[PDB]
Amino acid sequence: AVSVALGQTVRITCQGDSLRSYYASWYQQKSGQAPVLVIYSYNNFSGSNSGNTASLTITGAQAEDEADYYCNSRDSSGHHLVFGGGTKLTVL
Amino acid sequence: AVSVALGQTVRITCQGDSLRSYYASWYQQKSGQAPVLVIYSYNNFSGSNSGNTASLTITGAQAEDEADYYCNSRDSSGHHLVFGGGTKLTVL
Amino acid sequence: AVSVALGQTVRITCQGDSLRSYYASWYQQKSGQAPVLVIYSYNNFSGSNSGNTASLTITGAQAEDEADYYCNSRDSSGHHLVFGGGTKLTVL
Amino acid sequence: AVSVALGQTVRITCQGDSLRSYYASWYQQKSGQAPVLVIYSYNNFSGSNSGNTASLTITGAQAEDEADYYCNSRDSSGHHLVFGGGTKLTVL
Amino acid sequence: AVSVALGQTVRITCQGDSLRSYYASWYQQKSGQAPVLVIYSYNNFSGSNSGNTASLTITGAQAEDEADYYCNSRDSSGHHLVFGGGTKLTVL
Amino acid sequence: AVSVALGQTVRITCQGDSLRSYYASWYQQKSGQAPVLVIYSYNNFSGSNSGNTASLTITGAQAEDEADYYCNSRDSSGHHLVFGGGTKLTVL
């Protein structure tokens, strides 16, 4: 009569070798990530039956080195269903 | 009669080898990511039955090195359904 | 009678080898990403039954090196359905 | 008659070796991530029957080094269903 | 007649060796993560039958080094179902 | 007649060796994580039948080094079901 099934099957398989060999003297300098962000500063939404998905993301500085080598499923998601105002499924 | 099935099958398979060998002296300098962003600064949405998906993203500086070598499914998603104002599915 | 099925099958398979070998002394300099963005600065939406998808993205500086070598499904999505004002599916 | 089944099967299998060998003197300096973010500073949502998913994320500075080498499922999710205004599934 | 089954099977298997050998004198300096965030400072939601998922995250500075080498399922989740306004599943 | 079964089977198996050997004098300095966050400072939700999941997280400074090498299932979760306004499953 009714069958409601919410399933998520995530099968991730990685086979790899990361061999990193430095045989000689080296120098790395990635210094100085100081972005100055000044937003909406130093200056002189929805109604009754609705569905609203709003995202504000502010990041000053992000820096990834030698990372996420294999099968990086970070922050994975699915089927975002933002319904508003009343849902009705009916069979007669 | 009713059957509502929300499924997501993610099967990721990577087979690789990353061999990185430096046999001689080297120098790398990626310094100086200080973008100055000044937005809406230093200066003298929706109604009753609606669905609204708004995204504001501000990033000052992002820097990825030697990253995400294999099968990078980072921030993956699907079927974003932002419905507003009342949904009705009916059979007679 | 009613059957509503939201499915997403993502099957990604990569087989590769990244062999990077430097046998001699080298120098790399990618310094100086300081774009100055000044937006809407230093200066003297929708009504009742609607669906609105608005995106504002501001990035000062982005820099990817030696990244995303194989099968990069980063930020993947599908079926964005922003409905407004009331939906009705009816059979008699 | 009714069968409601919410399932999530996550099978992640990684086989890899990360061998990192430095045979010579080296120097790394990634100093200076002091982004100055000043947001909405120094300056002189939804109604009755609704579903609302709002995210505000502010990060000053994020820095990942030599991390997430294999099978990184960090912050993984699925089937976000934000329903509002009353749901009714009915069979006769 | 009714069968309601909420299941989550997470089977993670990693086999890897991280051998890190430094045979020569080295220097690493990642100092200076003091982002100054000043938000909504120094300046002169939902109604009756609804489901609302709101997240505000503020992080001053995050720094991960030599971490999450294998099978990092940190902060994993699934089937977030935020229902509001009264649910009714009925068979006759 | 009724069968309601909430199950969670988490089987994590990691086999790895982390051998870290430093044969020469070294220096590491990661000092200076003093982000100054000043939020909503120095300045001159939901109604009757609803389900609401709100998270506010403020972290001044987080720093992980040489951590979470294998099978890190820290803060793992599943099937967050925040229902509001009265649920009724009925068979006749």
Author numbering:
A (entry chain C), B (entry chain B), C (entry chain A), D (entry chain D), E (entry chain E), F (entry chain F): 9 to 52, 61 to 108
List passages from the publication reporting this PDB structure.
The disease arises from the misfolding and aggregation of monoclonal antibody light chains (LCs). All fibrils contain a stable core that is formed by two segments of the LC sequence. These segments extend roughly from residue 10 to residue 50 and from position 60 to position 110 and harbour the fibril cross-β structure.
The first patient (FOR103) showed strong cardiac involvement and fibrils were isolated from a biopsy that was taken from the abdominal fat tissue. The amino acid sequence of the FOR103 fibril protein was obtained previously based on cDNA sequencing and mass spectrometry (MS). Comparison of the mutant patients’ sequences with the non-mutated GL segments led to the identification of six amino acid changes in the fibril proteins of patients FOR005 and FOR103, and fourteen in the fibril protein from patient FOR010. FOR103 amyloid fibrils, by contrast, are right-hand twisted. The dominant fibril morphology from each sample was structurally reconstructed to a spatial resolution of 2.92 Å (FOR103) and 2.25 Å (FOR010), based on the 0.143 Fourier-shell correlation (FSC) criterion. The reconstructed three-dimensional (3D) maps were fitted with molecular models that depict polar and C1-helical fibril structures that consist of single stacks of fibril proteins or protofilaments, similar to FOR005 fibrils. The swirl of the key is right-handed in the FOR005 and FOR103 fibril proteins when oriented as shown in Fig. 3b, and left-handed in the FOR010 fibril protein. The FOR103 fibril contains even an additional cavity that is surrounded by hydrophobic amino acid residues. This cavity is filled with density that does not originate from the polypeptide chain, indicating that it contains a hydrophobic inclusion as an integral part of the fibril structure, similar to the previously described λ1-derived AL amyloid fibril structure from patient FOR00614.
